[PDB]
């Protein structure tokens, strides 16, 4: 497993891989890798000849410099994990290598609408940071395929739109949330549930799946759908916290034009705030 | 010569050229081609196996609908010219092919600083329109080389900065403006030159060349270089010179960090007002 830190050396490896006709997959990350990321790598290994993982804590997508400074860095552990997964190349550049003149005067890429809704409304500049570094990485790595998790549904929608709009010939693979055999989304948060709570916890996915079924069956009274969903969660032992249904492609309210919906649920159980999402074809 | 109008069909051709192992030069244009565009094509042909010319009147870089609608569209005559030049492929998409959902919500690319200075300052959104469509063309065509005319020095700097920042593996070639064998910059305004004035007119490029030579030799007293150039022009019969010297990469004053300069000059020959330009490596 090669670990590459500079642009010239990356371009050399990438040119040579492609010269040899290898199909390349890219998994962009900011390090601090966990099982979620290992599934992205496994999907990339099955779909391509060569897998490239980028590890870069990107200053452009942080709200303030103190947050950037506190972000966890675990490069050695990250590299041990990817080496065990047989990754071919890790690109781990410094901030000066990527942003030699800083970020403020660097060219950027902005996806209208998606970047300034939901999470992006409370984090100005964040998604601009995401679309800029992912575009740069696509040009540097020239992948055939790139893998992103469905848990971060907003980033996935953002990148899908960026790719379509900017003409990149890259397949974007959205990797579904990993689940236990009973349907519960795997998460560190499950660690805070008592055993009796752990037995109740699969109810969240059941309710989420119920919502999807209704939507798939033409129900469009979202307010009622959501009211019943909360009641059901609460009668199960949860404390419903937030339930939202949106257009999956544009992240706007579902309308007569929506073709896919994304459902987001959060509900407290004990000291855990469990979270899940699902996309449904319309 | 192939004429391609849709993205899927262009992509097919780009895949074919990759399989054939051909190096590709791209010449982006907004059509309504003339001899100076033919000079771009000839430079592309000399540097690559295959030449792709794009013809697309990009709404995103137009101030008002009026100006867009009124822009001359002459595809057939453009295509007859490129065929005589032995161009391999012409990409001429429709607006809906490029901007199926309009330009306002389309992903965009912005280059700080360069986009808002000089001509950029009075034309909000204009250079964002350019960086956007050129990035898209680069992603669609994936050329090895792209050719741009030196006369639009602001665009050239804009695209060189975009390429460096966004990580495109593409050589950007600036093509010096077209010129008579005696050195006179070609121009529709030349027609107003009488026989005698046409005889004096090559002196302008001689003075420009002298400025260029001085900057090459290390000279950095711009005011003095420019005052002397004005005196030389006066002596040859020109009047009311307007001469500017800029860093060609940042478009600001020449500095200790400057690596390239653009010299711009305008001078009157009787009632005719001649302009010319020259770029120089420092």
UniProtKB/Swiss-Prot annotation, chains A, B:
ATP binds at residues 30-37, 149-152, 178, 186-189. Optimum temperature is 30 degrees Celsius. Stable up to 37 degrees Celsius and loses activity almost completely when incubated at 60 degrees Celsius for 10 minutes. GO terms for molecular function: ATP binding; identical protein binding; pantoate-beta-alanine ligase activity; protein homodimerization activity. Transmembrane segments: none annotated. Optimum pH is 10. Stable from pH 5.0 to 11.0. GO terms for cellular component: cytosol. Pfam families: Pantoate_ligase. Belongs to the pantothenate synthetase family. The reaction proceeds by a bi uni uni bi ping pong mechanism. This is Pantothenate synthetase. The lineage of its organism: Bacteria, Pseudomonadati, Pseudomonadota, Gammaproteobacteria, Enterobacterales. The gene is panC.
């Amino acid at each position: 497993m090669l670990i590459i830190e500079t642009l010239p050396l990356l371009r050399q490896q990438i040119r040579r891989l492609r010269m040899e006709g290898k199909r390349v997959a890219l998994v962009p990350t900011m390090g601090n890798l966990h099982d979620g990321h290992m599934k992205l790598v496994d999907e990339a290994k099955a779909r391509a000849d060569v897998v490239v993982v980028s590890i870069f804590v990107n200053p452009m997508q942080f709200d303030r410099p103190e947050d950037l400074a506190r972000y966890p860095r675990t490069l050695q552990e990250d590299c041990e994990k990817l080496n065990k997964r047989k990754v071919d190349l890790v690109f781990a550049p410094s901030v000066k290598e990527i942003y030699p003149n800083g970020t403020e005067t660097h060219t950027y890429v902005d996806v209208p609408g998606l970047s300034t809704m939901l999470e992006g409304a409370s984090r100005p500049g964040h998604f601009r940071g995401v679309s800029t570094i992912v575009s740069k990485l696509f040009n540097l790595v020239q992948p055939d395929i790139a893998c992103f998790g469905e848990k971060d549904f907003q980033q996935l929608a953002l990148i899908r739109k960026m790719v379509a709009d900017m003409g990149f010939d890259i397949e974007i693979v959205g990797v579904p949330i990993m689940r236990a055999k009973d349907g519960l989304a795997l998460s560190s948060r499950n660690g805070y549930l008592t055993a009796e709570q752990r037995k109740i916890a699969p109810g969240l996915y059941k309710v989420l799946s119920s919502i999807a079924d209704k939507l798939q069956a033409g129900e469009r009274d979202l307010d009622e759908i959501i009211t019943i969903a909360g009641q059901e969660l609460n009668e199960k032992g949860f404390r419903a916290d937030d339930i939202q249904i949106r257009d999956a492609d544009t992240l706007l309210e579902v309308s007569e034009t929506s073709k896919r919906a994304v459902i987001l649920v959060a509900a407290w159980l004990g000291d855990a705030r469990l979270i899940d999402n699902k996309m449904v074809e319309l």
